[PDB]
Design an enzyme around this catalytic site. Structure first.
Site, PDB file in Angstrom:
ATOM      1  N   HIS A   1     -10.272  -5.487  -3.724  1.00 34.85           N
ATOM      2  CA  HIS A   1     -11.406  -5.076  -2.881  1.00 34.85           C
ATOM      3  C   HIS A   1     -12.392  -4.267  -3.727  1.00 34.85           C
ATOM      4  CE1 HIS A   1      -9.683  -6.667   0.721  1.00 34.85           C
ATOM      5  NE2 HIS A   1      -8.571  -5.972   0.563  1.00 34.85           N
TER       6      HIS A   1
ATOM      7  N   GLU B   1      -6.618 -10.439  -2.011  1.00 36.74           N
ATOM      8  CA  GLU B   1      -7.547 -10.108  -0.903  1.00 36.74           C
ATOM      9  C   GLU B   1      -8.965  -9.930  -1.445  1.00 36.74           C
ATOM     10  OE1 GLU B   1      -6.075  -6.839   1.476  1.00 36.74           O
ATOM     11  OE2 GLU B   1      -3.961  -7.539   1.344  1.00 36.74           O
TER      12      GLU B   1
ATOM     13  N   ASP C   1     -12.636  -9.523  -2.373  1.00 31.75           N
ATOM     14  CA  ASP C   1     -14.011  -9.462  -1.828  1.00 31.75           C
ATOM     15  C   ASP C   1     -14.768  -8.489  -2.722  1.00 31.75           C
ATOM     16  OD1 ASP C   1     -13.087  -7.012  -0.568  1.00 31.75           O
ATOM     17  OD2 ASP C   1     -12.754  -8.043   1.357  1.00 31.75           O
TER      18      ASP C   1
ATOM     19  N   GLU D   1       0.803  -1.246   0.000  1.00 32.16           N
ATOM     20  CA  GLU D   1       0.000   0.000   0.000  1.00 32.16           C
ATOM     21  C   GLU D   1       0.829   1.286   0.000  1.00 32.16           C
ATOM     22  OE1 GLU D   1      -3.103  -0.399   2.978  1.00 32.16           O
ATOM     23  OE2 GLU D   1      -3.746  -2.336   2.141  1.00 32.16           O
TER      24      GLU D   1
ATOM     25  N   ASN E   1       2.226  -5.401  -3.018  1.00 31.19           N
ATOM     26  CA  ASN E   1       0.765  -5.606  -2.895  1.00 31.19           C
ATOM     27  C   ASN E   1       0.060  -4.251  -2.742  1.00 31.19           C
ATOM     28  OD1 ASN E   1      -1.402  -7.663  -2.477  1.00 31.19           O
ATOM     29  ND2 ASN E   1      -1.503  -6.831  -0.376  1.00 31.19           N
TER      30      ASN E   1
HETATM   31  O1  LIG Z   1      -8.874  -7.601  10.524  1.00 24.90           O
HETATM   32  C1  LIG Z   1      -8.558  -6.510   9.673  1.00 24.90           C
HETATM   33  C2  LIG Z   1      -7.900  -7.058   8.396  1.00 24.90           C
HETATM   34  O2  LIG Z   1      -8.801  -7.805   7.608  1.00 24.90           O
HETATM   35  C3  LIG Z   1      -7.332  -5.927   7.557  1.00 24.90           C
HETATM   36  O3  LIG Z   1      -6.566  -6.503   6.513  1.00 24.90           O
HETATM   37  C4  LIG Z   1      -6.131  -5.540   5.542  1.00 24.90           C
HETATM   38  C5  LIG Z   1      -7.190  -5.283   4.471  1.00 24.90           C
HETATM   39  C6  LIG Z   1      -6.680  -4.257   3.474  1.00 24.90           C
HETATM   40  N1  LIG Z   1      -5.397  -4.675   2.854  1.00 24.90           N
HETATM   41  C7  LIG Z   1      -4.370  -5.052   3.846  1.00 24.90           C
HETATM   42  C8  LIG Z   1      -4.910  -6.114   4.843  1.00 24.90           C
HETATM   43  O4  LIG Z   1      -3.890  -6.370   5.808  1.00 24.90           O
HETATM   44  O5  LIG Z   1      -6.462  -5.119   8.318  1.00 24.90           O
HETATM   45  C9  LIG Z   1      -7.178  -4.442   9.383  1.00 24.90           C
HETATM   46  C10 LIG Z   1      -7.687  -5.469  10.383  1.00 24.90           C
HETATM   47  O6  LIG Z   1      -8.482  -4.813  11.379  1.00 24.90           O
END
Ligand SMILES: O[C@@H]1[C@@H](O)[C@H](O[C@@H]2CCNC[C@H]2O)OC[C@H]1O
Length: 302
Positions: free
Chosen positions: A207, A236, A238, A128, A170
């Site tokens: 996302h 990731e 969703d 990020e 990432n």
């Molecule tokens: O539990 C939560 C995680 O799902 C969240 O994960 C992030 C989502 C966005 N991209 C990077 C991932 O690490 O991180 C916050 C936590 O509260």
């Protein structure tokens, strides 16, 4: 054709993964569905900087190893997430700047990678680093204020620490080929390959929601990064509302790109999601399959 997501993906040489939370490893519905369906695991939180190095120089792999050991006991590989990131830093790292922070960033990479040396197929080394919006600028953080080279130094450190791991960059909002943020990431990877910076893979968080919607040009993005000489992965996934149509589109985009290694969805049941209110995953709260599950499995099975 296969009856589970991981096995279906494996027939084309790919994986189908999830994010696992250590505190949920006593939940029988969770562990049995995740065990059955996935062949790749990412720790949702346990391998982050704060969890692994809660005090400077004092590592704690207890929760991380619970996830890693569950994965290996259940026949899954592991993606390591994440070594250098603005978010979820422990307080002691948040207070550092400049050269002191640079040294701590390097020390953290070395210590975590040594613990997992040879055991992690992919690491999200840097996460990020780009800002949202039209600028294509770097995100403001202590890491970025230490110098533009923070990202390259993280990657060079990681290559030396574990030569067996694939090293990934990432990010999110980098799936749509026309977006400024995507182009900023493309130009960075292209530059890294020109200058010899070790980078093996790019992770697309995926996302997708109304503000950052899926576009068919995701396939173009994946193709164009693969052509730079990196593997690509959906890390990731969703999707707001879990529409079957979009879930199948994304799956088919990965299947169309030879260097797309696989797909990880960011959790198991909707209630496990960080964005549960958007009901964005493949399983219902009771562990039953949603329409999107069937669409994904069908796409994996051709
Ligand atoms: O539990 C939560 C995680 O799902 C969240 O994960 C992030 C989502 C966005 N991209 C990077 C991932 O690490 O991180 C916050 C936590 O509260």
């Amino acid at each position: 054709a296969e009856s589970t997501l991981g096995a279906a993906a494996a027939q084309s040489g790919r994986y189908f993964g999830t994010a696992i939370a250590s505190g949920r490893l006593s939940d029988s519905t969770y562990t049995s569905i995740a065990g059955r369906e996935f062949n790749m695991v990412t720790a949702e939180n346990e391998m982050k900087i704060d969890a692994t190095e809660p005090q400077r120089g004092q590592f704690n792999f207890s929760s991380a190893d619970r996830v890693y050991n569950w994965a290996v006991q259940n026949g899954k590989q592991v993606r390591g997430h994440t070594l250098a990131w603005h978010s979820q830093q422990p307080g002691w790292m948040q207070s550092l700047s400049g050269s002191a922070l640079r040294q701590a960033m390097i020390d953290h990479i070395n210590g975590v990678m040594a613990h997992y040396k040879g055991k992690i197929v992919q690491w999200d080394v840097v996460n990020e680093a780009f800002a949202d919006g039209s600028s294509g600028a770097r995100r403001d953080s202590n890491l970025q204020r230490s110098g533009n080279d923070w990202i390259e130094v993280a990657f060079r450190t990681a290559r030396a620490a574990d030569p067996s791991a694939k090293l990934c960059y990432n990010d999110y909002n980098v799936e749509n080929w026309t977006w400024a943020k995507t182009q900023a990431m493309y130009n960075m990877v292209r530059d890294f390959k020109q200058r010899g910076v070790p980078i093996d893979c790019v992770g697309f968080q995926s996302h997708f929601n109304s503000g950052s919607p899926y576009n068919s040009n995701f396939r173009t993005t994946l193709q164009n990064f693969a052509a730079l000489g990196v593997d690509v992965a959906i890390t990731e996934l969703d999707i707001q509302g879990a529409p079957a149509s979009t879930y199948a589109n994304v799956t088919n985009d990965c299947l169309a790109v030879s260097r797309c290694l696989g797909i990880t969805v960011w959790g198991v049941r909707d209630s496990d999601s960080w964005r549960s209110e958007q009901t964005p995953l493949l399983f219902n709260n009771d562990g039953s399959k949603k329409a999107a599950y069937t669409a994904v499995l069908d796409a994996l099975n051709g």
